[PDB]
Design a protein around this ligand. Sequence first.
Ligand code: DGT
Ligand code: MG
Ligand code: MG
Length: 430
Amino acid sequence: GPHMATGQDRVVALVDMDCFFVQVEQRQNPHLRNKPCAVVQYKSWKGGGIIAVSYEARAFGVTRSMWADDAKKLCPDLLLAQVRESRGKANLTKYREASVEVMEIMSRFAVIERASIDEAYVDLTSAVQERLQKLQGQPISADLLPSTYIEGLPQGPTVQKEGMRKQGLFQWLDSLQIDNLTSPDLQLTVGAVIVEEMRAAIERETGFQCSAGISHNKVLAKLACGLNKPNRQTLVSHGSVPQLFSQMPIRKIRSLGGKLGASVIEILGIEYMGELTQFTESQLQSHFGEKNGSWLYAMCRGIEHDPVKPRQLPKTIGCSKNFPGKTALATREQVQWWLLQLAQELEERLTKDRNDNDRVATQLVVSIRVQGDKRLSSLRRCCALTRYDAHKMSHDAFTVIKNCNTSGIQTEWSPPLTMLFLCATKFSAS
DNA sequence: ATTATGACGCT
DNA sequence: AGCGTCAT
Ligand SMILES: Nc1nc2c(ncn2[C@H]2C[C@H](O)[C@@H](COP(=O)(O)OP(=O)(O)OP(=O)(O)O)O2)c(=O)[nH]1
Ligand SMILES: [Mg+2]
Ligand SMILES: [Mg+2]
């Protein structure tokens, strides 16, 4: 009863940029705006692999991981932008730099956790206390929430989507207790007002549109963000969780879309997140381990305690390239030339990072995949990263992998290499 | 021949 | 440390 934690202590937002790489290319090339378009890596094999898709193109069934030649069968007028190639490999610098633009804007409002190139969590708890102090119990106008959906509303006793959005928002605002500065629903609402402001700032200052979720923790904020894309934001209240989860496939919750989620389904004989509530915490721990079990017990009740980490910069800087089927590297000269290409991109990015961010990486991780191995990584070895020198890094990477060569000949490489990966890690301030 | 990352957990 | 999972 009165002691049962409800996980309503924080206001957390998740901001995800809509079809990010597409928007970066559409900003640069206005001929791509408001068109079905996609971003592709490479071109020779099946037209290149699609990694981002505009919402107009998604209406035709174009998806990520589709070959552009097949996408063109679904959408013959699909427009394509190609990722830049440098030193023989895909170079994502333009999108990393665009991401920095967005993350700096969001950092003006609150401390953010960079979760990916195009999404960040925001801890708005303190900003919400501030805005509530400034409001002085003044009600929140629907005008301040022009792109907000309230999940689960409207409910109870129009045939157009904006009309439904506004009915739901009206029902929500009508039920608000605006004189209770500690009401979680009011705090979420103020958080949504702030996120409207943040998203407006991102669009004004970059041209990019985004979606967002506002809830009491990261998992619900992420889930919420996905409910009304593109260019909209969604508030998921604590009270909305029983109905939301009652039909929510377990795999939709972040961390459960893989083997653990499949095992929850098969072991417990359930389909939906809400069905987890019928198990004790000890039962879930017995199947899925102490940490997963406690997390699932709380998560299916809408409660999650994982903090928004104050981290705007990536923890690692890496370069990787696959060498599929017959492009596999089978000679020493090959392996060395490509280690050097990867190392030269890494050196460029590391030098920029040291100048921008006052830090130096101290460990170089070298990962490879050999032909025939099913695992995405066949071997990981670390060595010291003591100088930002591409020839030195590529020589060191060769030194740490050179005994994987089964060939008795010194010039041949067997089994041939289908993937090279260099990653700089363990940053120290400088 | 799904590609290029990147975070985090396990032991 | 090296490997696995999950994300996309
Ligand atoms: N290189 C590479 N980049 C990827 C891959 N998957 C996604 N990305 C990039 C391109 C996307 O624009 C960007 C952000 O991914 P998201 O999952 O947020 O999707 P996106 O923003 O494209 O669309 P969304 O509106 O969020 O559904 O990450 C991939 O497999 N390889
Ligand atoms: Mg994202
Ligand atoms: Mg996506």
